[PDB]
């Protein structure tokens, strides 16, 4: 559902996922080692962790629909997976928005070999 | 289908898509303005162009199956989309392998705002 995750990011941050968040910091768009550089990076870390709770699902490819109710994302429930994938995506999109005031352009293309820490448990 | 694409990449280049190809140059992992930086980057532009030949499909989320006969990728044919999407991924994975020897670590995290050329037609 990378497509739906992208639509959420667009609506919430006003930024297009690529290139603003596809390789941001140590965790946005991938990465297991930190520490996270900032709040935005922590949002992505939390998203990776959320996807870890979906071993029975295919988060990157399972399509789903969502609505906006009073400015809030409302997840569908056609299947258990779609619901949980959607909630994970909803969380990250809102988190990215809330920390726009600290978005750092010098982290947009952060070289991943700068992320040295261990893989910290979620 | 990004899942299948990633598997092919690993099988062909011995590298996982992230971080080696997820944001390489002006076109790998996304991008429109060029010109492409090198052979590897041109592989990604051609891949993007290939996906543009599948407007009736969803190349990033449509799952498909494939085999490896005699070291070669053998795409399935259950649906036309699964077949055509698989041939695009097969093509880019093989191209990345063919150009492994000129992969440039300094383009792995290329800042996209450095790609200032026009958006050439495919
Ligand atoms: C790398 C392409 C994926 C683009 C999706 C937008 C980024 C969301 C960031 C969440 C980080 C994560 O769970 O990897
Ligand atoms: C950005 C997540 C995509 C990860 C897959 C590895 C990149 C494949 C390269 C093809 C470039 C393209 O069509 O964007």
UniProtKB/Swiss-Prot annotation, chains A, B:
GO biological-process terms attached to the record: arachidonate secretion; lipid catabolic process; negative regulation of T cell proliferation; phospholipid metabolic process
GO terms of molecular function: calcium ion binding; calcium-dependent phospholipase A2 activity; phospholipid binding
Chief location category: secreted
Tissue expression remark: Expressed by the venom gland.
Cellular compartments annotated: Secreted
Protein family membership: Belongs to the phospholipase A2 family. Group II subfamily. S49 sub-subfamily.
Disulfide pattern: 26-115, 28-44, 43-95, 49-122, 50-88, 57-81, 75-86
Entry protein name: Basic phospholipase A2 homolog ecarpholin S
Species: Echis carinatus (Saw-scaled viper)
Regulation acting on activity, per entry: Suramin inhibits the myotoxic activity.
Xref: CDD domains: PLA2c
Secreted listed as a keyword: yes
């Amino acid at each position: 559902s990378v497509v739906e995750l992208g639509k959420m990011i667009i609506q919430e941050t006003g930024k297009s996922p690529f290139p603003s968040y596809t390789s941001y910091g140590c965790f946005c768009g991938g990465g297991e080692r930190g520490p996270p550089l900032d709040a935005t990076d922590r949002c992505c870390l939390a998203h990776s962790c959320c996807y870890d709770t979906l071993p029975d699902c295919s988060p990157k490819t399972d399509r789903y629909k969502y609505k906006r109710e009073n400015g809030e994302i409302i997840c569908e429930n056609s299947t258990s997976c779609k619901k949980r994938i959607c909630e994970c995506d909803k969380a990250v999109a809102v988190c990215l928005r809330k920390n726009l005031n600290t978005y750092n352009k010098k982290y947009t293309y952060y070289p991943n070999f700068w992320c040295k820490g261990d893989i910290e448990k979620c």
